[PDB]
C-alpha cells in the first residue's frame, strides 16, 4: 500500500539554509532584513526573491565554504514547495513592532487584530491549533529569473533560463519553475479568488478554518465547535465574507511566437494563472519573458472520462519582464531654436518614404490637428482634421498611416475589412470564453 523509497532530496536541512538565506547576507544592511520589515511595515506587498541572490548566496555558501546543497536547480526542478517552506519560515524572523501599524486606519486590519485579540481573549477565559500562518501574510512571494551573466559562475546547464516555446514545453516540466515567452491573448479580467475564509457559528460561536486547497472544495456547516456541538442539537454556522481572505487572481493565456514553431503545426497557446501583487501586470497582445510555476490541476469532471488521468495542467505567474516598456520642452528647445518647424518637421514625417513632401506637409497639419473651438452654446466646431488620400495601387501610403498612428497620439490604424460596422459602432458582440455579451 503506497510503496515508499528514499531519495537524496530532504527538506529538513534546506529549511535551515532558508533561515540563513534570509536576513543574513551582505552584497545586496541586507535586503532580506528590513525589506521584509517594510512588508511588515506595510509599505510594500510583493516579496521579490531573486534566483540571482540564490546563486550569489551559494557563492557565499560554497566558494567561500562550507559547501551547501543545491538551490536554484532544486528550485526550478520543483518550483512549488519552495513557496510553502522558504516563505513559511519568514514568519519567525519578521520584525514585531513594526513601525506605525495603527489599526483603523485600515479596514479588516482591526478585524484581524481583534480576531486574534478576541481569539486569545476567548482563549484566555478557557485557559484560566491556531489560525494558520498563511492567514496573516499581506505579502506575496515572486521569484525572478537568472539569465544570467553571473549564472556563468558557472552552474552551466542548470540554467533555464531560456524562454522556450510551448512546443518546446514538455510533460516532465510539470513542477518546474521556468521561463516562457509569448504574446498575451484574451487575458481574463482580474477577479478575487479565496483564502481562509473563516465561517462564523451561531449559538456559542467560535470558528474553524477550511483550507483553500486546489481549485474547488466541499463547503461545510454542521458544527465543529464543541460547545455549539452536541448541545443542542447542533450550532448552526454560516460564512463570514469579511472573515475571508482573497488572493488576487487573473488568468491569461499566452500564445506562441509563431517563429518558434515548425512550419506546419498551428499555434499552441498555453494556460497561465496570475496570483498576487503581479496582478494587472499583463495586458492583451503583449510579448514578455514570463516565468512561473507550472503545475497540474485535475480535474473536476468528467473524471472517469479522463483517463489517463490526462492532467491538462496550467501555469502560475511568478515573474514578469516586459520587452519595450520644462526639460522636456528643453528637449523641444533645439527644435524651437531650429526654426522651420513646419517644413522641417514636414520632412521628418515618414522619412522612409521618398518624395511628395507636399503630402507630408498636410500630414503635419493632422498630427497636431487643432484647435477646435467652442461656440458658447455650445456645439463643437472641429477641431479635427479628416484629410484623405487617393491614387493607387500600393504607393506604400499605408506606410504614411502606419508610421502616423505609431507616432500620432491616440492613433487607430484600420482598413475596410478591417474595422467593421460593429468594429466602429458599439454593439453587444458576445464575449468568447469568459462571459457574457460584453
Amino acid at each position: 500500500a503506497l510503496p515508499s523509497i528514499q531519495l537524496p532530496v530532504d527538506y529538513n536541512n534546506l529549511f535551515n539554509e532558508i533561515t540563513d538565506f534570509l536576513v543574513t547576507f551582505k552584497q545586496d544592511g541586507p535586503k532580506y532584513m528590513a525589506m521584509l520589515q517594510k512588508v511588515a511595515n506595510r509599505e510594500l506587498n510583493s516579496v521579490i526573491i531573486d534566483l540571482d541572490d540564490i546563486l550569489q548566496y551559494q557563492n557565499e555558501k560554497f566558494l567561500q565554504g562550507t559547501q551547501a546543497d543545491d538551490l536554484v536547480s532544486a528550485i526550478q526542478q520543483n518550483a512549488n514547495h519552495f513557496t510553502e517552506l522558504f516563505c513559511r519560515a519568514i514568519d519567525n524572523n519578521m520584525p514585531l513592532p513594526t513601525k506605525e501599524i495603527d489599526y483603523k486606519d485600515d479596514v479588516l486590519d482591526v478585524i484581524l487584530n481583534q480576531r486574534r485579540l478576541r481569539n486569545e481573549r476567548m482563549l484566555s477565559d478557557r485557559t484560566n491549533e491556531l489560525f494558520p500562518p498563511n492567514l496573516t501574510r499581506r505579502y506575496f512571494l515572486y521569484f525572478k529569473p537568472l539569465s544570467q551573466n553571473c549564472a556563468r559562475r558557472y552552474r552551466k546547464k542548470a540554467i533555464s533560463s531560456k524562454p522556450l516555446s510551448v512546443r518546446q514545453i514538455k510533460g516532465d516540466f510539470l513542477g518546474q519553475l521556468i521561463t516562457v515567452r509569448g504574446i498575451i491573448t484574451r487575458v481574463s479580467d482580474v477577479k478575487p479568488a479565496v483564502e481562509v475564509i473563516a465561517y462564523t457559528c451561531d449559538q456559542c460561536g467560535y470558528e474553524v478554518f477550511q483550507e483553500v486547497n486546489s481549485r474547488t472544495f466541499t463547503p461545510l456547516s454542521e458544527c465543529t465547535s464543541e460547545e455549539c456541538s452536541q448541545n443542542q442539537t447542533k450550532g448552526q454556522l454560516f460564512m463570514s465574507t469579511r472573515a475571508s481572505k482573497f488572493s488576487a487572481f487573473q488568468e491569461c493565456k499566452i500564445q506562441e511566437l509563431s517563429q518558434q514553431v515548425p512550419v506546419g503545426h498551428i499555434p499552441r497557446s498555453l494556460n497561465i494563472h496570475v496570483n498576487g501583487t503581479l496582478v494587472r501586470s499583463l495586458s492583451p497582445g503583449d510579448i514578455v519573458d514570463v516565468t512561473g510555476i507550472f503545475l497540474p490541476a485535475p480535474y473536476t469532471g468528467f473524471k472517469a472520462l479522463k483517463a489517463g488521468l490526462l492532467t491538462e495542467t496550467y501555469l502560475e505567474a511568478q515573474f514578469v519582464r516586459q520587452h519595450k516598456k520644462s526639460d522636456v520642452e528643453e528637449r523641444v528647445m533645439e527644435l524651437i531654436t531650429s526654426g522651420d518647424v513646419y517644413n522641417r518637421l514636414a520632412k521628418s514625417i515618414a522619412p522612409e518614404i521618398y518624395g511628395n513632401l507636399d503630402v507630408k506637409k498636410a500630414l503635419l497639419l493632422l498630427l497636431v490637428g487643432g484647435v477646435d473651438k467652442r461656440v458658447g452654446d455650445g456645439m463643437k466646431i472641429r477641431g479635427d482634421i479628416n484629410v484623405c488620400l487617393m491614387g493607387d495601387p500600393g504607393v506604400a501610403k499605408s506606410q504614411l498611416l502606419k508610421a502616423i498612428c505609431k507616432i500620432s497620439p491616440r492613433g487607430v490604424y484600420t482598413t475596410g475589412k478591417g474595422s467593421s460596422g460593429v468594429g466602429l459602432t458599439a454593439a453587444v458582440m458576445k464575449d468568447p470564453v469568459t462571459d457574457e455579451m460584453i
Binding site: 510539470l174 506546419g264 468528467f302
Partner: protein, 589 residues
Amino acid sequence: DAVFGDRVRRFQEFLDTFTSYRDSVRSIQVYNSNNAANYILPHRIIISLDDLREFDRSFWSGILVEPAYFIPPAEKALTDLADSMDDVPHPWKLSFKGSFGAHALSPRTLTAQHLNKLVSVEGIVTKTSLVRPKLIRSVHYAAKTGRFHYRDYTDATTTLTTRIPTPAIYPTEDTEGNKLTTEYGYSTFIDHQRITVQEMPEMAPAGQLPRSIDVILDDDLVDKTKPGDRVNVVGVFKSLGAGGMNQSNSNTLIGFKTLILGNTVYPLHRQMLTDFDIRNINKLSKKKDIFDILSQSLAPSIYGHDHIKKAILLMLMGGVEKNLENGSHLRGDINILMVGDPSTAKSQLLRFVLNTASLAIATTGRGSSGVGLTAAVTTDRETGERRLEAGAMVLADRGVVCIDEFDKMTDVDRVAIHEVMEQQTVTIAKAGIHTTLNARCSVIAAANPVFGQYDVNRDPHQNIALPDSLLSRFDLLFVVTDDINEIRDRSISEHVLRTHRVTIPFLRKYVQYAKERVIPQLTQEAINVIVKNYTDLRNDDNTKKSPITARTLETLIRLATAHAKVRLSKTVNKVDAKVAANLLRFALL
C-alpha cells in the same frame, strides 16, 4: 510470470551477442552526459527485426504475435542492459523497423486476427488530435515522519497488459494519517496523443471512401508528425474498452473502438546525400547551361513552354528570404498563375508540381472554408477545449499551393487569399483564438479565359477573371494560346502519339540541397542592370500594355535570386539578372 523472466534471459543472450546495438546504446549513454558537459536525447532504440531470426525464430514470431507477452520483458531488457552500463552520473522504449510481413498491411483493412499483434500500417496523417500531457506516476512527501512516498498509475492505454483500474485519485494521507503533498517536478508525466491515419485516397479500391484509424503516440512520438504527412506507423493493435457489456448500457451490437500503441512512425515520400551523390550535384552545378536542362526535364510529355518551366523551378527554390530587423519581412517565395484556353495542359502541368516539389497540397477551385483557415473545429474535441486544425494553406506553409480554377473560387475566399500573399499570414478571429500564424507559402494556380477562346482577343482587363489586388501579388501571369500552326501541329501530334507508346528524381535531390546550401544574398551587378530595365519597362511597357508596380520589380530580386540558387553561386551575379530580364519579357510578350 517465470516465463516473463525467461523471455528476458533468452533475450539476455541477445544482449552483447551480437553487440552491434550496444554501440548506439552506449552512444545515448554518452551524448546525454555530453549534453551534461554542455557549457535532449530520446530514450528508445531502432531494432531491425531482420537480425532476430538469427537467434530465436521461436521468440521472433511472437514479438509480432503476442507482444503483450514478449515485448515487455525485452523492453525491460533494454533498460536492464543500459542500467548495467556506466554511469551513475528511466523506463526507455522501442521501435523496430520491418522487414515485414503479415502484418505488412495498409490501414484500409484490419482485424480480426490482425488485432493484438505488432503491425506496420502506413498513410495520410489526419486530423491530428492535439497534444495534452498525461498523468502516470504519483509521488508525495510525508511529515514529520518524512521519507518519500509514491504510487504508480496505469491507464488502459499505457503499456499493453490488462491491469486493474488504477485511476483516479491521489493516495492522500496513507496510514498513519500524515499529510502528503503532491510531488510535482518529481512524479512522472509522459505526454499522450491519438492520431488517426487515412489510407491513401488514390490507392482506394473503388467508390468506397477513405477510412482512417487512430494510433496512440506516447513520449517522443508526439510533435514528430504534422497532419497530411505520409507515415508508416508501426506498433501493436490493442483491443480496448468494454464491449458495452461492462454495464447494462447499451443493449446493442456496436462496440470495441480500437487503435494501435507504440511504436515507430517513419515519414515517407529530405534527403540522404552521402558524398558520392552531392559530388554529382556539384559536378553538374559547374555546367552553365544546366538551368535550361533542369527546365526541360520537368515535363516529359509536354511541349516546350520552357519559360513557364524555368518559372516553376524559380518557384521551386523559394528564392531565399530576407527578414527585417524590428520590421515586416520581404517575401522571397514566388507566386505565379497560368491562364489560357482549355487543353493547355495547365492542370496536368500542376500535377507535375504535385510530386517532385516536396509538398505542398493542390486544390481544384473549392476550396474553403477559408482554405488554410482552420475554420475552428467545434465544439471542442475534446475534454472541453475548443480547437483549431490544419487548413489547406496552413498545411502548405513553406510549400506549394496549386489551384485548378482559381477563377472559379468564391469571391469570399479571395479575401483571405490576399491575406495568404501580401500579409503572408493567417488572421483568425472566429470564435475564438486570435492567433496570427505564418502563411508563408509558394503558390501557383491556373485560370481559364473568363469567356471562351477570347483570352487572346480581349484586353487583359476583363480577361483577368479575378481582379484586382490578386493580380498585384502574382509574380507572373502566363497567357498560353491554343492557337493553331499546322506546321506546329505535326510536331504537336507525333510526340503526343509516341506519348502513349535530365533526370527528375535527382532534380528533387538537387533542388532540396540548393535550398539550405546556400542563399546567394546579392551583388550590385544585377542591380546595375535591372534598374535600367525597370525604368525601361515603365517608359515602354506603358506604350504596350499594363500593369507596372514597384512589386513587379521586387520580383526581379526574387527571380534573379532563384536562378542564383540554380547556379549554386555563393552570391547573386549579373547574368542571373539577365535570366530575370529574360523571364519578364515573355511574361508580358
